Amino acid sequence: GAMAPSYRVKRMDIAKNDEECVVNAANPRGLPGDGVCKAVYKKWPESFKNSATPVGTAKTVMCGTYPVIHAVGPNFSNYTESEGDRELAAAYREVAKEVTRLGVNSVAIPLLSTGVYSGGKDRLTQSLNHLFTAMDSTDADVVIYCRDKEWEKKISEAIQMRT
Ligand SMILES: COC(=O)c1ccc(O)cc1
Ligand SMILES: Nc1nnc2ccccn12
Ligand SMILES: [Cl-]
Ligand SMILES: [Cl-]
Secondary structure (H helix, E strand, O other), rough: OOOOOOEEHHHHHHHHHHOOOOOEEEOOOOOOOHHHHHHHHHHHHHHOOOOOOOOOOOEEEEEOOOOEEEEOOHHHHHHOOHHHHHHHHHHHHHHHEEEEEEEEOOOEEEOOOOOOOOOOOOOHHHHHHHHHHHOOOOOOOEEEEEEOOOHHHHHHHHHHHHH
């Protein structure tokens, strides 16, 4: 575990993380995909061997010794707000189990279902709160990756509010 487990946020490409493992915002079919998923495919293509997994689950595939945790959030275009919220929470619980199993001291994580799976809505708070619910009981240093300047400020404020 980390000596003083923490949350941090960084505004940069998650493919350039400084953590011991990465969470991919995957699609269920293990395809190269869009956004975070395509950056992860370019950096760790070997990790897409048999990476397909259902919505609400996470599947880890090693690239060398570096773990890629493929976490499948729901596409809110297809799911109801109610069912989507349940699957989004479940995906993060499966990420916490994998991070714990791997014994890493740090993990790089994106906000699941906030990009092309958002159904055209702002889901920063919804996704971040499900991340906290899952990860608060783990002792890994968690570094949350985003790309938007106002998202960085809102994520930073949410972390500091609890400290
Ligand atoms: C924090 O998000 C990313 O790491 C990211 C990488 C590549 C993209 O095209 C989009 C987002
Ligand atoms: N998760 C995330 N980081 N930056 C952005 C920007 C728009 C929508 C989602 N985002
Ligand atoms: Cl960058
Ligand atoms: Cl997304």
